[PDB]
Design a protein around this ligand. Structure first.
Ligand SMILES: O=C(OCc1ccccc1)N1CCC(O)CC1
Ligand code: NI
Length: 341
């Protein structure tokens, strides 16, 4: 059973709704981004039209093996007609290829679906500036005031400076970065650049990165682990046991590991500043958890919504409990009363 919040009223469209079989009445399936909770159910045997960005389309074809005849990539920032309805894709400031979708309904209603996003003041000068939005389907992942974290720029400055210091003190240190999906590529790219190295990884992860349209990517990444002093590993391996095991495989080239776990928010955000962050250490291994978010903080989300002034908000995250739903509804009303819409 497809939930109501994945259906767009007055259309035959669904959004991120691939795990419910054939949805009755659906003439086009939109996919906002290539994260597994959103693409769940897509496979090589899918036979309906999928609308998405070019980058998402590359990943569908190459990683999931969806046949090319069912993949409909659309350019960003461009008015397009899909089954008789005007739509626009906008950058969501999430992972590579992630979009928000503007739907212009035949009856004059305008709907914005944010997919997953990290709201930014730059969105206030997109094609959103032009007209009124009646309904907002909102990524509410962090819709509570306890969810604070730094800018992406601040977190990258910390990572670059930490890695450059450690490897300059000990040239035989290896840097490892955890990953389990697309997104957060700036973490490993920025560290490798300050160290004058390519990033080494598995054939499978290399394939994924080759789909992302990153400028000059062949200069930045490699499958030749021996040539690289920044390695990527699955997130599940970023622990003392898994890193000890990896160090053994490196043939006595290295005598220390510095590792990074990009998380989203963790409760240590409610005490500590980024500047004060310390690692967990066992012997010659140290692990840093860094709060690199690709979702809106509470303050970023509030600013975006109070600027956009929607008539109705439909949450798409944390929808499963009465407590969560009640909390979100209280915040939306505060925001509306404060700003006067
Ligand atoms: O039928 C609905 O949308 C139209 C639609 C039907 C089937 C496939 C795609 C789209 N909605 C919208 C939301 C309403 O609350 C109740 C369900
Ligand atoms: Ni996501």
């Amino acid at each position: 059973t497809c939930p109501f919040y994945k259906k767009i009223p007055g259309t035959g469209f669904t959004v991120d709704a691939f795990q419910y079989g054939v949805v009755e009445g659906c003439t086009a399936y939109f996919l906002t981004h290539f994260h597994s909770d959103h693409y769940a159910g897509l496979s090589k045997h899918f036979t309906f039209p999928v609308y998405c960005s070019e980058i998402t389309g590359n990943l569908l074809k190459n990683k999931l093996h969806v046949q090319e005849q069912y993949i409909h990539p659309l350019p960003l920032d461009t008015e397009c007609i899909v089954n008789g309805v005007k739509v626009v894709l906008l950058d969501a400031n999430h992972c590579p290829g992630a979009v928000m979708i503007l739907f212009y309904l035949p009856n004059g209603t305008v709907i914005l679906h944010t997919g997953d996003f990290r709201a930014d003041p730059s969105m206030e000068r997109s094609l959103l500036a032009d007209q009124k939005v009646h309904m907002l389907y909102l990524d509410t992942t962090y819709c509570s005031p306890e969810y604070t974290f730094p800018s992406q720029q601040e977190v990258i400055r910390f990572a670059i400076n930490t890695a450059f210091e450690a490897v300059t003190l000990n040239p035989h240190a290896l840097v490892v970065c955890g990953t389990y999906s697309i997104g957060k590529e700036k973490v490993f790219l920025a560290i490798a650049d300050v160290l004058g190295s390519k990033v080494g990884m598995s054939q499978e992860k290399y394939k994924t990165l080759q789909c992302l349209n990153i400028p000059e990517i062949n200069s930045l990444i490699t499958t030749d682990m021996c040539s690289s002093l920044v390695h990527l590993l699955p997130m599940m391996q970023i622990n003392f046991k898994g890193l000890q095991s990896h160090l053994k495989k490196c043939g006595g080239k290295y005598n220390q590991i510095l590792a990074f776990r990009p998380t989203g928010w963790t409760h240590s955000n409610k005490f500590t500043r980024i500047a004060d962050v310390i690692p967990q250490t066992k012997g010659n291994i140290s692990i840093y958890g860094i709060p690199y978010s690709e979702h809106s903080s509470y303050l970023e989300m509030k600013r975006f919504v109070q600027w956009l002034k929607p008539q109705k908000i439909i949450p798409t995250v944390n929808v499963g409990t009465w407590k969560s739903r009640s909390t979100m509804e209280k915040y939306f009303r505060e925001w509306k009363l404060e700003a006067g819409y």
